Design a protein around this nucleic acid. Sequence first.
RNA 1: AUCCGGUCGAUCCUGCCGGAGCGCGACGCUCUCCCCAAGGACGAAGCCAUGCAUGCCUCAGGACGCGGCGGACGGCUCAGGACAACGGUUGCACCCCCCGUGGCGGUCGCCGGACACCGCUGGCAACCCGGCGCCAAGACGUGCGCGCAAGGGCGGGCCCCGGGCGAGCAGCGUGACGCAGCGACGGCCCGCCCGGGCUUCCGGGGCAUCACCCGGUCGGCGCGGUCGCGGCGCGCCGAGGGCCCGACGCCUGGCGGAGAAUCAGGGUUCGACUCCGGAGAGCGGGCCUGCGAGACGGCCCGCACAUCCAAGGACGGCAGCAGGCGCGGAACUUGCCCAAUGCGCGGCGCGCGGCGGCGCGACGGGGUGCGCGCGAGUCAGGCGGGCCCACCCCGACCCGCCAGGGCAAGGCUGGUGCCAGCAGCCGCGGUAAUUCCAGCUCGGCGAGCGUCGCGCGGCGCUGCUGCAGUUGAAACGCCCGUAGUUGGCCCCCCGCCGCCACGAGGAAACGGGAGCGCUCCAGGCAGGUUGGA
Lengths: 258, 142, 166, 90
Amino acid sequence: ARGVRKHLKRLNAPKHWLLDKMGGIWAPRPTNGPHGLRECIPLILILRNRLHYANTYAETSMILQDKNVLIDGKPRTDPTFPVGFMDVFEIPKVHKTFRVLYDVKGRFTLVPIQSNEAGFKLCRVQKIFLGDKGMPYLSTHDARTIRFPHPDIKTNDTIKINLKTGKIDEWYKFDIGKIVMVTGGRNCGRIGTIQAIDKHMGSYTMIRMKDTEGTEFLTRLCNVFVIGNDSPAVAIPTTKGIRPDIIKNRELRLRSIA
Amino acid sequence: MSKTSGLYTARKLRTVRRVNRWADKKYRKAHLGTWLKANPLEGACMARGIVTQKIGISAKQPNSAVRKAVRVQLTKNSKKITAFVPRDGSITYIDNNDEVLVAGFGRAGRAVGDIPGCRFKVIKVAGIGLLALFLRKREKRA
Amino acid sequence: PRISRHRNSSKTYSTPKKPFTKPRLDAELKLCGEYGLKCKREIYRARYMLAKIRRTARNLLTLDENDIKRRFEGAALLRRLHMLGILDEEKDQLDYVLGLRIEDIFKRRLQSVIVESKLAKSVHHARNMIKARHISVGGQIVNIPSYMVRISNTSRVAIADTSSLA
Amino acid sequence: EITVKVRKVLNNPLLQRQQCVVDVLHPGCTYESKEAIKAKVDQKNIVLYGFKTSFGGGHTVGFCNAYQNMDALMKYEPGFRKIRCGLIEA
RNA sequence: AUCCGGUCGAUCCUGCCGGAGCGCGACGCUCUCCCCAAGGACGAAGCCAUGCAUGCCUCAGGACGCGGCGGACGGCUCAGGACAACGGUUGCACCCCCCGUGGCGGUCGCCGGACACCGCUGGCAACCCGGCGCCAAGACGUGCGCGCAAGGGCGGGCCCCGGGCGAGCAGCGUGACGCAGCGACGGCCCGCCCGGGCUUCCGGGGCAUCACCCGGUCGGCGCGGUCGCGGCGCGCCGAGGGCCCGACGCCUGGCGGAGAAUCAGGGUUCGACUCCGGAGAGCGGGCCUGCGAGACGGCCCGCACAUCCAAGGACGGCAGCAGGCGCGGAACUUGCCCAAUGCGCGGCGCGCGGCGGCGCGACGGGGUGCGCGCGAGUCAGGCGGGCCCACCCCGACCCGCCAGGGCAAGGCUGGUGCCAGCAGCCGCGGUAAUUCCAGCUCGGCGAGCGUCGCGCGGCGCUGCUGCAGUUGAAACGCCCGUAGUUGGCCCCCCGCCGCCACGAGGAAACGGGAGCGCUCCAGGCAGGUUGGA
Ligand SMILES: [K+]
Ligand SMILES: [K+]
Ligand SMILES: [K+]
Ligand SMILES: [K+]
Ligand SMILES: [K+]
Ligand SMILES: [K+]
Ligand SMILES: [K+]
Ligand SMILES: [K+]
Ligand SMILES: [K+]
Ligand SMILES: [K+]
Ligand SMILES: [K+]
Ligand SMILES: [K+]
Ligand SMILES: [K+]
Ligand SMILES: [K+]
Ligand SMILES: [K+]
Ligand SMILES: [K+]
Ligand SMILES: [K+]
Ligand SMILES: [K+]
Ligand SMILES: [K+]
Ligand SMILES: [K+]
Ligand SMILES: [K+]
Ligand SMILES: [K+]
Ligand SMILES: [K+]
Ligand SMILES: [K+]
Ligand SMILES: [K+]
Ligand SMILES: [K+]
Ligand SMILES: [K+]
Ligand SMILES: [K+]
Ligand SMILES: [K+]
Ligand SMILES: [K+]
Ligand SMILES: [K+]
Ligand SMILES: [K+]
Ligand SMILES: [K+]
Ligand SMILES: [K+]
Ligand SMILES: [K+]
Ligand SMILES: [K+]
Ligand SMILES: [K+]
Ligand SMILES: [K+]
Ligand SMILES: [K+]
Ligand SMILES: [K+]
Ligand SMILES: [K+]
Ligand SMILES: [K+]
Ligand SMILES: [K+]
Ligand SMILES: [K+]
Ligand SMILES: [K+]
Ligand SMILES: [K+]
Ligand SMILES: [K+]
Ligand SMILES: [K+]
Ligand SMILES: [K+]
Ligand SMILES: [K+]
Ligand SMILES: [K+]
Ligand SMILES: [K+]
Ligand SMILES: [K+]
Ligand SMILES: [K+]
Ligand SMILES: [K+]
Ligand SMILES: [K+]
Ligand SMILES: [K+]
Ligand SMILES: [K+]
Ligand SMILES: [K+]
Ligand SMILES: [K+]
Ligand SMILES: [K+]
Ligand SMILES: [K+]
Ligand SMILES: [K+]
Ligand SMILES: [K+]
Ligand SMILES: [K+]
Ligand SMILES: [K+]
Ligand SMILES: [K+]
Ligand SMILES: [K+]
Ligand SMILES: [K+]
Ligand SMILES: [K+]
Ligand SMILES: [K+]
Ligand SMILES: [K+]
Ligand SMILES: [K+]
Ligand SMILES: [K+]
Ligand SMILES: [K+]
Ligand SMILES: [K+]
Ligand SMILES: [K+]
Ligand SMILES: [K+]
Ligand SMILES: [K+]
Ligand SMILES: [K+]
Ligand SMILES: [K+]
Ligand SMILES: [K+]
Ligand SMILES: [K+]
Ligand SMILES: [K+]
Ligand SMILES: [K+]
Ligand SMILES: [K+]
Ligand SMILES: [K+]
Ligand SMILES: [K+]
Ligand SMILES: [K+]
Ligand SMILES: [K+]
Ligand SMILES: [K+]
Ligand SMILES: [K+]
Ligand SMILES: [K+]
Ligand SMILES: [K+]
Ligand SMILES: [K+]
Ligand SMILES: [Mg+2]
Ligand SMILES: [Mg+2]
Ligand SMILES: [Mg+2]
Ligand SMILES: [Mg+2]
Ligand SMILES: [Mg+2]
Ligand SMILES: [Mg+2]
Ligand SMILES: [Mg+2]
Ligand SMILES: [Mg+2]
Ligand SMILES: [Mg+2]
Ligand SMILES: [Mg+2]
């Protein structure tokens, strides 16, 4: 081409969006922002496609013009705004507060949370670097920037941020035996404990985890998010990160029409 | 073993097959490219042309007859062909300037039966299907 | 493009390789006599629908009795074959699938079911009655002679309450 | 006709309305209109659409938007549904 | 996981010729009802009349105009290009990036004048413009401010090995230059994000009647240029680089992949067109504006073609949507609409896209009766739809196309008399024809049948699985011999290949496949706590 892409065909949209192949040539293209294109969901795809508060695009706009939706405590008036992992989703007029996590099939789900919990956010430290006049900065998985961080915080740790001041009140270190959740790949969405860290000079570092039923699995270090120290700092869905096999899933499916 | 074996001989096994493939007449006719050049129809199902003459052609040895045919000039490449007219009494719809649609006899460019040097046949005359003209379903102007 | 370019379609029958074989030529018309079959295509369809369920079983039977693919797909195949009534309950072995014939498929047609319960005197009268919207399946009026009736829905085949024969 | 039932009711205090699926049952006979059964499902704040009849008849499925105000309907309703009810006609 | 007719007086073979299946187009004949659905690609990337395909929001009633964002995305095509492109897999410690989302914000008293819209006058055939004059800003220009933009000199350890790495990388201090950017409604700058540029490894057409090829070609040093590395360019130095594990040259009616047709297993053939990537806009070149273009619904020039004209001049690019000419065997309406799916500005825009029309390319379902009730049509009301229609609901009326000696299912009368004709192959016809032309009867498939061409199958007649070489076609007249291919037996319990298994990571659609009665079905992703595994 001669410049950036502004469209996204429906068959080319990410597969965990669960878009259906009829009823449209086009799909919404997420605007740049706190999250990337592949690992996100356009906000409209929650209000219209999922919760049916709106039923078309045009009337999905008017909900976001009068500012009925807060993301991390701020009203976003943009239908293709990228919302993603750990974002707080609060609709006041219906009194619904959610936290955006993954389910055991790598898709985004909303978990109900209490008013005592929606005032903070977990971020993953992506890098530490020296900015202007040699000052230290840290960057997160949300495209957030913090100057003068405490020297203990190192890369791959997670930090806890109050959602009004935008400052740090807690941090969790990446270690052996920490509770963790996988954010992408093919073990996305399930929760376990770290039991190995194998570094390969020049190449990717692999992590081996083990579920609460003891199933062991592997992935890359760029996909493991710490959610606490042997106890998750937040709430998690009812399945709690245990993935069935196809046979047990089939028997649970047979039981729904039963 | 009259063929090479061995775990590292894939290149030889492929070279032999590539070379000996050309020894088959079917493959050589369909893949070389000289038949496509020499084909009067240029690799098409049918072709239209104008009639230049009406002729009668002797049959071959055990038969005895006079088959009816027409010399045709092709519109698209100006080649000379002869085409057979089947179906009793059909040579009477063919004036000396009659656009004809012409197809093959089958056998993909080989002569059939007892007509020497004939590989094509007329299927339409001056816009009208010749078979339906014989079956008396349509008719020519005048 | 247009959206219609993304719609799928498929052929659902296979024609035989030698058309002019006498013994299957008359075996193919005894079938058109015992069932009100319109034309040979409705036989072809049947054989095609057999040739797939025969291909699955022979793939799983080559496998091992404890593999998950057998445990999953053979159970699915048997559970599907028991609801349509193409196979009966007492044969719950994957090896009992291979000895199946077309007639087992033809016996679960609505045209055949209504003949069995004697709603229609013959199979031709049955086809005519089907076209006249005179018969309902579970309170639902069904117009298709070739309809396939599940064993759940065979207790409940009647004349439609709205009808001139009521 | 004589049988009208509703499910999948969602209250939407963002668009000032309630959304419903409606099942209509008329064994043997027709149900005459949507304007008729509008009484069973005030009346002027009900928006009925997307009605399909099954094969053989007897069943119908449709959708209801029930508003609470009247500005709300002139604000949040597509400009051609307000002409199908005669409410504006331009 | 199948064969059958044809070489002879008869017989067994080799071997081809012909028949029988599926798909894709074209031609012929024929056609009741409903659902889905392709449609000027096929050595003419040949030429185009007409209309439409890009607009939407700081300073005054409104327009108009200024200013701003977008027009580089979307649509079309397959001409070029064969160690390209493209697919998987790496890297930038050699890079650039608008919007959006976080940060950050220290810089050696309210200024000026003038441009368009507009007034008054003009030129010109028309295209297009001139002169004078009053007037604004979220437009410019200059700037009030706690010094800090680029680049540059020194600040490292002389077995071997946190700010941040696998890796001396990034910052800072200190001597010199410089004075950039941001400030008249406060933003220069920094991280991420998407996107791009190049880049590592493997894959990546045919011809040997193309055996040697290259000379910025292969490497080194130094500068220049670039966003940036690099023979990318230039000066100097050396003689390298590739090749029977097929270089170089030539040819291609050559866009690549995801895929598609065929069908036991192994394979063969095709990749125009839906998604992803690339390239182009009659053919060469050149460029401006911009974050982004070597842009063609932007500009400039040469060439080949057309357009209007008072003859002075001016002016064009449908491989966008319809439509036309030409060409070909071969391909539709100069319709309605932004209601949906999305994109730009926020309210509109949009020939993207949606809805109808033509449409036997092709798919799916149901009829031309049954033992006595229906559908196709007709007229009304619903439902649906941007508006109309089709489907669905309620009310009252009411075949055809090929054959009949064998392959291969199916046999009497008249005409013709090696003529007319048939016949894929065997063969038929010489005035008693199981085959021509007709009548009767009968056979096959069936709203669909026949003909022509091609791909796959048949074919173990291309053979890896798996052919043949005494005499049917086929062992070089013989010996040496390099590349290549192949190489006895033995130690087990190390390293490095191969190999087997299991993982991680990356795209869907297609293909399989779990669950679900669009009345069935080809479908679709539904649905009644759910689900798209
Ligand atoms: K392109
Ligand atoms: K761009
Ligand atoms: K762009
Ligand atoms: K799509
Ligand atoms: K689509
Ligand atoms: K599409
Ligand atoms: K967007
Ligand atoms: K041999
Ligand atoms: K051999
Ligand atoms: K050999
Ligand atoms: K070997
Ligand atoms: K050979
Ligand atoms: K075979
Ligand atoms: K023979
Ligand atoms: K002999
Ligand atoms: K023989
Ligand atoms: K064309
Ligand atoms: K073309
Ligand atoms: K061609
Ligand atoms: K063609
Ligand atoms: K053309
Ligand atoms: K711009
Ligand atoms: K532009
Ligand atoms: K086109
Ligand atoms: K091309
Ligand atoms: K841009
Ligand atoms: K590369
Ligand atoms: K490379
Ligand atoms: K490469
Ligand atoms: K390569
Ligand atoms: K060659
Ligand atoms: K030189
Ligand atoms: K250099
Ligand atoms: K030089
Ligand atoms: K030199
Ligand atoms: K070569
Ligand atoms: K070509
Ligand atoms: K195979
Ligand atoms: K083979
Ligand atoms: K195969
Ligand atoms: K085969
Ligand atoms: K096409
Ligand atoms: K294309
Ligand atoms: K393409
Ligand atoms: K595409
Ligand atoms: K694309
Ligand atoms: K592209
Ligand atoms: K393209
Ligand atoms: K291009
Ligand atoms: K070009
Ligand atoms: K051009
Ligand atoms: K050009
Ligand atoms: K040009
Ligand atoms: K050019
Ligand atoms: K660019
Ligand atoms: K240029
Ligand atoms: K150019
Ligand atoms: K035009
Ligand atoms: K073209
Ligand atoms: K049109
Ligand atoms: K023509
Ligand atoms: K013509
Ligand atoms: K619209
Ligand atoms: K934009
Ligand atoms: K259109
Ligand atoms: K009736
Ligand atoms: K009727
Ligand atoms: K009547
Ligand atoms: K009737
Ligand atoms: K009647
Ligand atoms: K005949
Ligand atoms: K033939
Ligand atoms: K034959
Ligand atoms: K024969
Ligand atoms: K006679
Ligand atoms: K073969
Ligand atoms: K084969
Ligand atoms: K075979
Ligand atoms: K042999
Ligand atoms: K010979
Ligand atoms: K010889
Ligand atoms: K010989
Ligand atoms: K020899
Ligand atoms: K030799
Ligand atoms: K020798
Ligand atoms: K020797
Ligand atoms: K030797
Ligand atoms: K040797
Ligand atoms: K060797
Ligand atoms: K060898
Ligand atoms: K070897
Ligand atoms: K050897
Ligand atoms: K291996
Ligand atoms: K994708
Ligand atoms: K749930
Ligand atoms: Mg484009
Ligand atoms: Mg030299
Ligand atoms: Mg291709
Ligand atoms: Mg292609
Ligand atoms: Mg096209
Ligand atoms: Mg353009
Ligand atoms: Mg250009
Ligand atoms: Mg023509
Ligand atoms: Mg039907
Ligand atoms: Mg073969």
